[PDB]
Design a protein around this nucleic acid. Structure first.
Ligand SMILES: [Mg+2]
Ligand SMILES: [Mg+2]
Ligand SMILES: [Mg+2]
Ligand SMILES: [Mg+2]
Ligand SMILES: [Mg+2]
Ligand SMILES: [Mg+2]
Ligand SMILES: [Mg+2]
Ligand SMILES: [Mg+2]
Ligand SMILES: [Mg+2]
Ligand SMILES: [Mg+2]
Ligand SMILES: [Mg+2]
Ligand SMILES: [Mg+2]
Ligand SMILES: [Mg+2]
Ligand SMILES: [Mg+2]
Ligand SMILES: [Mg+2]
Ligand SMILES: [Mg+2]
Ligand SMILES: [Mg+2]
Ligand SMILES: [Mg+2]
Ligand SMILES: [Mg+2]
Ligand SMILES: [Mg+2]
Ligand SMILES: [Mg+2]
Ligand SMILES: [Mg+2]
Ligand SMILES: [Mg+2]
Ligand SMILES: [Mg+2]
Ligand SMILES: [Mg+2]
Ligand SMILES: [Mg+2]
Ligand SMILES: [Mg+2]
Ligand SMILES: [Mg+2]
Ligand SMILES: [Mg+2]
Ligand SMILES: [Mg+2]
Ligand SMILES: [Mg+2]
Ligand SMILES: [Mg+2]
Ligand SMILES: [Mg+2]
Ligand SMILES: [Mg+2]
Ligand SMILES: [Mg+2]
Lengths: 209, 64
RNA sequence: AAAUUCUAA
RNA sequence: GAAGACUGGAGUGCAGAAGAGGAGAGUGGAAUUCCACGUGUAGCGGUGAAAUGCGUAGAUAUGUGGAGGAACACCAGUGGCGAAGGCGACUCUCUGGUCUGUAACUGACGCUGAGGCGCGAAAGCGUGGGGAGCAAACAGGAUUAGAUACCCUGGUAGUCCACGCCGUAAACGAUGAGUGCUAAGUGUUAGGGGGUUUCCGCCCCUUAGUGCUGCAGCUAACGCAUUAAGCACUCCGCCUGGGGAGUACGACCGCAAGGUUGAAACUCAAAGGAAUUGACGGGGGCCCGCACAAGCGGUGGAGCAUGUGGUUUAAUUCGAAGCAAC
């Protein structure tokens, strides 16, 4: 971002300074994204999965579209804590979701009273909003993808405690050590996030097809 | 927002410049704070020294 | 800011 | 250890800068008190409420002149200076230190420092001057069950000055003095160098102080964090459970009050630091219940029924005693 709120642990990746903000060197970025494409290719063809975490709005739409295109698993709304550690409780909740959806779609669509609208629809809508792509996550994600690491501390902490690789774009205002494998990019403009996430999904598809 | 002695370009504030020492005193008869007038540091101090001297020469009012 | 005292054991 | 050599420590010169650093002499304004004068009439003063107090010899208020003492409104700001205590009106004389810049000079001249020698807020002492206001002791008036206090009306030493003593403090950053090394962000004081620019101004770098936030690291935790409580080297001071006790005996210092040095017998099994969750407050916020607000009618006023403390008798049966017993 600006030259005030920045992390000195990323002075390697800054290059000169325009009037107002820092300027990121691009050659390091192209080397990093080539390496990231290679690693995503190495990891995708394993009958596993790759998780997408859309913290900010740009990330929201971008990761939703890219995951749907690639058929992967993603989280889009607020990341409720404990998905990668309380996975028992999360899977209980998603089993609840599947059962209620099945019964509402098949059985009767009318239990007994006029009490479906008051709670039994609003809570289902809210839970479907929060969970989203977890309804298909069979096991444990192999490599998270985060747009803004400093705006998603809970997810990176939960992944690092379970010790699974992390890939993500680190702006100048983040510490590039919590994420084990980094690409320096601006996570504030909708254009760049789309390009990077689409490249990651394309690499996954090309390797795993 | 701007220091007068940095904008106009005055070197030092002698105490005979009664008209110069009116844009810095209150109409009630006291030195105005630094904030309302936006003066520098060196010039605030030498300005208040000059005002005290001129006052004690019965050349500005102590009160009223 | 104002502002009277006051559980012994 | 000896003989040489060097400048990156230390000091001198050269050019600039800021400052309530210190001492002596002299002037200024506002205000409080006292004195004199001109109308000026019955109150002024003070507390939660009053009274003591001042006032018909005429107060308070009111304008005009004179005397004296003490402190310096605004400027004033985690601003400045000092080794520390500390330093705020103005002017002059005598004076100490620090910071920046250049590279002219000497060439390790440095750091620390027991014992010594000095300075050291306030109170206090001896001599001599002053003394407006405040005010220990003290007198009176209030409060309270009592009030040797808090509150009110007065008031001596003292607070002030010259010379000489005293030598203590929560004298605190509760943090000894030197020198190096180890992410950042943002204010401010005194400097220097550079670019835009006729000037003005804006931006960048560097030195010495002064604050806030925050990594690595450290910590029992609170927290500290380039002004370290981090990583290291040199010298000094101090600690070894709580009382007894900074007491007793000895010594030195002081006019005295006292200061510095400083034990044991006996006794206890604890005394302590940080933060944890509860309970409390004569600490705060916010919320509610006929709490209050608004209306309606009631009680205390008279007669009358029941119950209650005293009552007297032989007992006037025992038991419930602020809402929450009558
Ligand atoms: Mg960003
Ligand atoms: Mg030198
Ligand atoms: Mg007078
Ligand atoms: Mg008096
Ligand atoms: Mg009078
Ligand atoms: Mg008068
Ligand atoms: Mg100093
Ligand atoms: Mg002081
Ligand atoms: Mg200085
Ligand atoms: Mg000594
Ligand atoms: Mg004294
Ligand atoms: Mg005396
Ligand atoms: Mg002190
Ligand atoms: Mg100091
Ligand atoms: Mg001490
Ligand atoms: Mg030490
Ligand atoms: Mg010393
Ligand atoms: Mg040290
Ligand atoms: Mg600074
Ligand atoms: Mg400056
Ligand atoms: Mg500094
Ligand atoms: Mg920490
Ligand atoms: Mg602090
Ligand atoms: Mg700190
Ligand atoms: Mg400090
Ligand atoms: Mg300090
Ligand atoms: Mg320590
Ligand atoms: Mg003992
Ligand atoms: Mg001792
Ligand atoms: Mg203690
Ligand atoms: Mg405690
Ligand atoms: Mg009414
Ligand atoms: Mg009646
Ligand atoms: Mg009656
Ligand atoms: Mg009974």
């Amino acid at each position: 971002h600006q030259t005030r709120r920045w992390n000195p642990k990323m002075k390697k990746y800054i290059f000169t300074e325009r009037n107002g903000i820092y300027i990121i060197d691009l050659q390091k970025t192209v080397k990093k994204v080539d390496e990231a494409f290679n690693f995503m290719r190495e990891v995708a063809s394993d009958n596993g999965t790759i998780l997408f975490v859309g913290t900010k709005k740009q990330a929201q739409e971008s990761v939703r579209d890219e995951a749907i295109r690639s058929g992967q698993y993603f989280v889009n709304h607020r990341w409720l804590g404990g998905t990668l550690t309380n996975f028992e409780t999360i899977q209980k909740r998603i089993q609840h979701l599947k059962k209620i959806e099945k019964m509402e779609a098949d059985g009767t669509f009318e239990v007994l009273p006029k009490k479906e609208v008051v709670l039994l629809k609003k809570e289902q809508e809210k839970l479907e909003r929060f969970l989203g792509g977890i309804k298909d996550m069979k096991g444990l994600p192999d490599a998270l993808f985060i747009v803004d690491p400093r705006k998603e501390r809970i997810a990176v902490a939960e992944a690092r405690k379970l010790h699974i690789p992390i890939i993500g774009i680190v702006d100048t205002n983040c510490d590039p050590d919590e994420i084990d494998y980094v690409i320096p990019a601006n996570d504030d403009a909708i254009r760049a996030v789309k390009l990077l996430t689409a490249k990651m999904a394309d690499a996954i598809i090309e390797v795993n097809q | 927002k701007v220091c007068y002695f940095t904008s106009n370009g005055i070197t030092h504030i002698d105490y005979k410049d009664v008209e110069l020492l009116k844009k810095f005193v209150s109409e009630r008869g006291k030195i105005l704070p630094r904030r309302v007038t936006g003066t520098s540091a060196k010039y605030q101090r030498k300005l208040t020294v000059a005002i005290k001297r001129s006052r004690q020469m019965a050349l500005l009012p102590f009160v009223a």
